[model samples]
Target chain A: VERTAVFPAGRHSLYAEHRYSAAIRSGDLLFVSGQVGSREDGTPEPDFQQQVRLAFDNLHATLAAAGCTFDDIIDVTSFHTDPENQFEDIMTVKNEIFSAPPYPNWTAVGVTWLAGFDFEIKVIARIPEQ
Target chain B: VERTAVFPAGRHSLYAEHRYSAAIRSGDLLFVSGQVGSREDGTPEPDFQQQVRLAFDNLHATLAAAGCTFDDIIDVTSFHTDPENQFEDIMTVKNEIFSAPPYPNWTAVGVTWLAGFDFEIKVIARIPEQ
Candidate 1:
């Protein structure tokens, strides 16, 4: 099957420089890469809560580019550098994004590295028919 | 669209106890939960190499449940407790499993915990048209 790399508006240049796609569209699913809280210039956000929010924002941008949204997301996997300390903040932001029931299936894992960031999230979303 | 939870034959009971599916099928795609190298009773495999191989075997089971194969996979995210030490072994198993071109997109992250496990793998695969 054919796959297309999806890029969002005002996407960070680092994706190109790193030779990776922001997300890949295959069949009716959008497989997003791990989204971090990187700024326009590709710097990690210093504040943890804001970083989490920014990561979601960046993820939304990629979803929008693929004609999908948080509601279309079917699965989520988040990596945290400090799961104990970061859990509260992550849930706070997650609740705001996914405020209702029937939320996407999620699995959280504790990681030791994220290059420079402390959190990263990736997902698989079902693309709505055009 | 409606989605369905998918489980492999001879699946571990931990999935039911944990209240999570082994994988979820939505709109022609299979969003798989992270697979760890564990025995049927949910004990982690002690040997790193055998554990990695078992994880893949477990993943293959989930894929089979959805009527897909490694060739149908589009995205892969693997968590490693010690990436630096485990990279060679992972690549060896990965290469043997994915021995040809058109391999799935991969991102490896160094994780700190896997609940007594050292490696975990998750993937999204396109279900073949029925």
Candidate 2:
């Protein structure tokens, strides 16, 4: 299958400004860029949890456009400035997103800052052949 | 193929210290940890280009042990301390690695710092069915 490069309506400006596809799918695998918790207006929330919530909102929109779902996610890598304090809060929301088994593999890295945001998430997922 | 967990000779210390598998391959998909430009000895080289180079070397070694290669890479996400300054050099080496299209999808994120280092590289690759 050809790679379907995607710019979801939710992040059209971001794809134009950043020159990165929000998500791309080739055959059975879908690759998504790490998303920061930003609102529709592109301003980040000061409250980390709120921002993280928004990030997943975007993740779902992007994956749906690609014909995949959270159930298909195979792996995730998150970057954060202070995993010491923020990891649990982030996982609290993450667990709420994928509530069942065969969950995606997850890894967290401690960064000092994430493009001026406190947290960012990116993942890979599997979808049936079209 | 069953998911294979790998521990290469080059990153024994890191995998043990950080409590992460150096690399994991499930079926045809390989997910690798974001590798920094540090020596096997754990000290990061101060030069940006040098660090990027070593990171790839480590990437190659990790995949090689898992029976994959740089050519199989499908997507890459790199986090940088100052992409404004370091991105060019990072791409300079990245360009030299795959050298042709079907190049993997790539994204660069700006972070304040990466585990006390300046750069980190992580990737996903597709191996042929075993």
Candidate 3:
């Protein structure tokens, strides 16, 4: 299967620096890299709660670049440094983005590090057929 | 696109209890749940190295059930409790499973927990067309 790399505007520098694409489109599916709450220069947002929201914001752009939306996502996996203390905040942002049922399958794990960030998210979405 | 849940034999009960599929087939893509090094009874394997291998073993079964294999995997994200100390062992098993390049895109994170297990892995694979 042929695959194409997808990137949102302003994200090229960060992706180039890391040597990976924001996402890879294979057939009608988009395999997204783990999106973090980093600024244009690749530094993590100082605020934890906003960081979670920004992570999703960044994810939105990647998905949009591939012509899909949150509704097209089939699976999600999130990593957090402190799941016990951070669940509510993450959920708060998650609910806003994925507010309905028939929601994507989700799996959350508590992680020790995130390259200086508190949270990260990745997903697979079926690209809408023409 | 319609989605179907796929599971390997003898793993039904565990997936039923968790209320999630071992893998979800959407279009020609497979979105697999995080696989841990758990025994049939869902308890974590005691040995760390064996646990990592078992996690891959379990992943193999999940992929096989979907008519795919490691070579079909396009993306992988693994979680480890102690990345600094555990990297070598994980890589040992990983190299064995994915020995060649043009290897799948990989992202490894140091996690704090895995529901009693030390490692977990998830993946996305493109299903071959008939």
Candidate 4:
């Protein structure tokens, strides 16, 4: 079946150069494309931490656009260039975004590079019937 | 919607330091975390082969945790540091995990690192209503 869903909010404005957030909901699941830490114009962040935060921010925006929140996220997969140096900080930010007791399931990998930019974060979430 | 579901078994005991397996079901699907080759207590194996095996074992454990097997997986994306070097072996194991007839859709990517120290493997599955 063709996937369909609402794109996250602030997507076009946040990454103005981009056309729209890539979100498709198949059945009840929303598959979000990999989000990089970049301005709407697609400029890369000089700092890794800022990039990481921006990636999550973009992810959050996508989720919000779909009428969901981080709480509705069921799974997340992250690709990083430097896992050792950046994992702790990434997890710290992740925990900040997710709630306690029932954190969303996550998978993180350290890669040599990511498509489109340096670092990338992608997520899949469930959108319940309103 | 809040995410929910099962964790693969053999997760905690295999990576003892990690504690319980990380899996959740948000509806009809199950979300799995990254799995790496390691015995319980998170000891790093000497070779990449052994580590890769243990990682899958942990993943299978988590699948078992949710009462679903690999066959239930609907989609998968893999992360690898040396996609050229290790991808073959990893895919071999992954293919071994599931059956034919209707193989699950997948995405594979090369990465520099993975959580829990070195190489890792992770997945997500859909448990249809029984």
Q: Which numbered prediction scores highest in DockQ against the true structure?
A: 4
Best by TM-score: 4
- What's the distance in Å from true for residue B34, model 3? 1.9
Backbone collisions counted per model = 0, 0, 1, 27
Docking quality (DockQ) for each candidate: 0.27, 0.19, 0.28, 0.56
Native-referenced TM-scores of chain A, all candidate models: 0.95, 0.89, 0.93, 0.81
**Model 4 misses residue B41 by how many Å?**
1.9
Model 2 TM-score (B-chain only): 0.90
Instruction: State model 1's lDDT.
Output: 0.84
What is the C-alpha lDDT profile of model 4 across B61-106, one tens digit per residue?
A: 7788778777777777666667788766766766676646687777
Candidate 4 structure, TM-score to reference: 0.79
Compose the digit string of candidate 3's lDDT tens values, residues A9-109: 66446788878889998776789999998888899889988889888889888999988777777887888788878877876777677655444555679
Q: lDDT, candidate 2, residue A40?
A: 63
Write the residue-wise lDDT of candidate 3 on B48-104 in tens digits.
999999888888898999898888899888888889999999888888878888888
Per-residue CA lDDT of model 1 for A42-112, tens digit only, reads: 89999999999999999999999988888778888888898878878987898788766455656679977
Give the C-alpha miss distance for residue A60 in model 2, angstroms. 0.6
Candidate 3 residue pairs that clash: A111-B111
Instruction: Give the per-residue lDDT digits (tens) of candidate 2, residues B1-130.
Output: 5767875665447677777887888777788988887787677888889988988888888888888787666677887887767767976887688565444555566766578788888888776664
Off-target runs (Cα >4 Å) in candidate 4 are A1-5, A8-20, A115-118, B8-21, B87-107, B116-119
- Lowest summed lDDT window (length 10), candidate 2 chain B: B98-107
Q: What's model 3's lDDT at B81?
A: 83
lDDT of model 1 at residue A65?
93
